[PDB]
Amino acid sequence: ITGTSTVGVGRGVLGDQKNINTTYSTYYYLQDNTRGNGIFTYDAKYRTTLPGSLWADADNQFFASYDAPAVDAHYYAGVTYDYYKNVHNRLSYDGNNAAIRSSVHYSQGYNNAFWNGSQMVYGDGDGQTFIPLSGGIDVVAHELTHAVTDYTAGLIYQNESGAINEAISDIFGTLVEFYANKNPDWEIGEDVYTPGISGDSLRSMSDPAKYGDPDHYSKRYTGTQDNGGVHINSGIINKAAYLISQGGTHYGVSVVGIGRDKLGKIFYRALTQYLTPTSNFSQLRAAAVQSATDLYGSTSQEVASVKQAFDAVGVK
Numbered sequence: 001i002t003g004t005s006t007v008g009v010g011r012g013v014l015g016d017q018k019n020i021n022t023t024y025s026t027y028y029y030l031q032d033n034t035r036g037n038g039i040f041t042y043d044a045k046y047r048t049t050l051p052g053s054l055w056a057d058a059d060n061q062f063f064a065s066y067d068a069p070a071v072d073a074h075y076y077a078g079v080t081y082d083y084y085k086n087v088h089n090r091l092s093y094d095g096n097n098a099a100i101r102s103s104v105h106y107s108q109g110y111n112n113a114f115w116n117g118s119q120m121v122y123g124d125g126d127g128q129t130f131i132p133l134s135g136g137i138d139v140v141a142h143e144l145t146h147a148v149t150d151y152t153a154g155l156i157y158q159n160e161s162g163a164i165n166e167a168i169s170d171i172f173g174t175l176v177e178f179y180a181n182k183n184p185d186w187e188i189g190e191d192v193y194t195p196g197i198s199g200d201s202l203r204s205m206s207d208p209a210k211y212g213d214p215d216h217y218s219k220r221y222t223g224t225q226d227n228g229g230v231h232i233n234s235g236i237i238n239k240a241a242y243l244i245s246q247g248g249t250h251y252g253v254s255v256v257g258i259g260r261d262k263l264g265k266i267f268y269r270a271l272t273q274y275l276t277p278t279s280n281f282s283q284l285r286a287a288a289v290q291s292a293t294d295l296y297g298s299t300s301q302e303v304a305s306v307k308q309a310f311d312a313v314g315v316k
């Protein structure tokens with residue numbers, strides 16, 4: 001909408017207060033004009049017709065329970081935009097400042113979130129498996145990263161290419177969580193998963209097998225559930241990324257960590273320069289090795305650690 005840029009205040013899903021960029025034109029809208037061509041947050045009103053209505057508020061204060069998922073979707077989309085711009089010199093998901101759209105209150109009891117080809121979509125959860133999923137910065141950044149992938153490598157959402165697609169979203173979701181630096185970890189979705197259970201997560205990158213996901217290529221899933229295991233086999237790549245950053249000895253193979261910033265540079269370059277829609281795990285290893293070579297040199301520690309990490313997870 002056409003209006004003037006304003007700053008509202010509200011509370012997110014976890015009860016924390018934050019300032020949000022809004023737009024005033026009769027109502028105050030969840031429309032942040034400070035980032036690219038805007039960040040826009042919509043109310044899906046418990047229905048499945050998208051996007052719903054651009055979120056309107058009478059007073060620029062967003063403290064109602066119903067407001068909380070919208071506050072966090074809007075705010076964390078902004079943090080994710082800032083990460084890509086400041087860290088990778090990427091302007092929104094298309095590289096040309098495309099408007100970022102999200103809808104909250106999607107459906108009823110909806111235990112998921114997704115990128116639908118055009119926008120982000122967040123369920124509220126059923127209150128037992130999940131609380132509203134936009135409360136997780138890693139989840140929000142995971143979703144926006146699907147848009148980045150779709151505009152760049154274009155990894156097809158099945159089998160190995162789809163597991164790479166998923167891992168890319170978990171990797172950058174985690175790197176955005178570290179960028180914001182509020183309780184960061186290598187777990188996925190801990191802030192919104194299972195409100196009745198402390199200390200669990202939807203996935204772990206440091207130890208995928210904690211939640212049943214493989215941590216070695218020999219343990220990959222080969223069936224047809226979950227688009228050929230895209231959220232399962234992502235554990236193999238998530239573990240390799242964790243090892244590149246943090247180091248460790250895994251199945252007897254030792255990896256010297258090189259830190260998060262270098263992990264992010266290597267995988268961002270691989271995603272945007274070398275991966276293709278049909279890349280498999282072996283091709284990802286080659287892309288990551290080449291990316292590290294470009295950035296740091298063929299004889300560098302960084303290249304050596306990429307190779308060790310993929311060796312540790314059984315990917316040649």
Ligand SMILES: CC(C)C[C@H](NC(=O)CNP(=O)(O)CNC(=O)OCc1ccccc1)C(=O)O
Binds near residue numbers: 113114116143146
């Ligand atoms: C219990 C769940 C929260 C776990 C998991 N989801 C995630 O980890 C995050 N959502 P996501 O990975 O973005 C879904 N995304 C997904 O299933 O994409 C299918 C699609 C393709 C094209 C258009 C619309 C949807 C899942 O779906 O099993």
Ligand SMILES: [Ca+2]
Binds near residue numbers: 058060061063
């Ligand atoms: Ca209000």
Ligand SMILES: [Ca+2]
Binds near residue numbers: 177182183190
């Ligand atoms: Ca965390």
Ligand SMILES: [Ca+2]
Binds near residue numbers: 177184189190
């Ligand atoms: Ca996390």
Ligand SMILES: [Ca+2]
Binds near residue numbers: 193194195
């Ligand atoms: Ca929990």
Ligand SMILES: [Zn+2]
Binds near residue numbers: 142146166169
């Ligand atoms: Zn995903």
